[model samples]
Target chain A: VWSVQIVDNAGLGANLALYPSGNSSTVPRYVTVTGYAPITFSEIGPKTVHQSWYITVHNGDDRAFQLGYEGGGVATATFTAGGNVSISTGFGDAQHLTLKKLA
Target chain B: VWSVQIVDNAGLGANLALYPSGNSSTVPRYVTVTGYAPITFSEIGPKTVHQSWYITVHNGDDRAFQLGYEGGGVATATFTAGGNVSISTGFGDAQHLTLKKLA
Candidate 1:
């Protein structure tokens, strides 16, 4: 199985979006929030599957914002207030993925 | 912080939504899909907080639907073929709530 993780620190009153690979281009799975945790895949089957994950954050300020990965295989994207922040994941194959929010 | 959990089995062609307590009247939190796990809270502080959690399911057929919880302090709501299924949580207050989707 393949796994991925992400974190968002767009500060308060910010919106975040996430898209997983393999899904249709017209319908992408997304989540909007301020704080999020990493995603893990535990039951990846034998398949040459390609998966990509990305995130977008909308800051509440008009100035340029910065986002950073705290640790692990996670990354953060920064943008200005109301600006769009996006990040993508490398291709991989997996059967199942488990996402856990870290404290 | 308070915690809540929800599960939906409206089949492949269905949708699910979730709303946490303490949010604005117009801005409710929701998740759309099937097969969800339980939510847990670990850091519920002392307070008189009133929290409510509920779910709605849209079945693909024109028949009554049934949804149930696996275990723990959780509950399930059922709906029928695009019928509206709703469930609310008991009022309570806490510092933090941890939600963990059951495996």
Candidate 2:
């Protein structure tokens, strides 16, 4: 069970945390992604920087990731409907992402 | 770990499954949502159909599901920004969904 979260993620009200930003619980909780959409780059690495960063993956942390292309990129890497797009680099600013769990 | 998938899913080419669309792997992976955005009904037993359908679940196969309201429906369901929304009825047509890996 890989858990993905953001470094800037926060809760809306009192003591709550957004998307359980960091954790090891494998019960599959709703990591509230209130607004973390997607990102894209013309080229280079980490082409798309999603908001759910600080990627402290869990359980299956040793596996490869999938990336969903919003748009614009060189279709040269091993691709899927999704992939660990961190594959592209130079992650941009205001980058918000929502890492879905699949495998 | 629970695994969710679609019934109408397919890989870009070759014989890859859209999301491992039917599995019981405890190790999490990225379930692709190429165009599976969301859906809503005037009402639904399977209200707001997410593309990742088929109803086959993994580890937590016995637990309840979740839903993210994109448009309409009754607000009398157990929700946490997401829930087992298949509770609504008459899951409409051409309904594409993105079942997030949440508890």
Candidate 3:
């Protein structure tokens, strides 16, 4: 699983934690996300920076997949398109995101 | 865990499956929900009949909790208030629901 974050200006951001399949006990096990934060980024590398940032993900199919997270949160990441993500935990302010494929 | 549904006027509804804590391996296992259906209800038994039905749940705390489900879906049931539920699978139409304490 991939653990990424929605980085904001001034290098401040929230953490988006990802989990592998069958890693959940309550929800059906699959890719999951749990976002929270107050950490500093040592180096952002060449990652894209935006004034307003958000990300969504997909499974390359038409079916919509659900991603579980901390506090029993669930987000529907569709196969047809990227799913919208919400960073509501420990991120200063709630941030909404959409997933995309990396180059 | 309890399994309930948001039944409609025709006695048709979707199934809301609940799981015990630590049942998930991906997301942190707590109380989770996975709703899907094509079920037949023998008797609703004076259950509240709602025309446009939606249910949300809570854990009686100020912190919000996450609930995971089939195909890797997640929903946040808040401690301060009820969480909104969306039945997007199996049911004829996607139903929106909210949680409540039973008498």
Best by lDDT: 1
DockQ values of all predictions:
0.05, 0.03, 0.04
Ranking of models by DockQ: 1, 3, 2
* Model 3, residue B93: C-alpha shift (Å): 32
Per-residue accuracy of model 2 over B1-103 as CA lDDT, tens digit each: 2333333323222211222223443222222221211211111134233633322211111112333333222212111222222233233322223233311
Q: TM-score order of candidates, best first?
A: 1, 2, 3
lDDT per residue for candidate 1 within A1-103, as digits (tens), equals: 2223334444434344443432333221334333223221222222222323322221210111112221222332333333233443322211222222312
- Name the regions of candidate 3 deviating beyond 4 angstroms: A1-29, A36-103, B1-30, B36-103
- Please provide, for model 3 over A1-103, each residue's C-alpha lDDT reduced to its tens digit, 9 standing for 90 to 100: 2233332322212213223223323322222222211111111122233322222222211122222234423333221113444444232344444432211
Instruction: Please give the ranking of all candidate structures by lDDT, highest first, separated by commas.
Output: 1, 3, 2
True contacts kept of each: 0.00, 0.00, 0.07
Off by over 4 Å in 2: A1-5, A9-32, A40-103, B1-4, B13-90, B96-103
Model 1 agreement with the true structure over B22-73: per-residue lDDT tens digits: 3332221333333222121122222222223322121211111212222232
Instruction: Locate the minimum summed-lDDT window of 10 residues in model 1 chain B.
Output: B55-64
* Alpha-carbon deviation at B13 in model 2, angstroms: 7.9
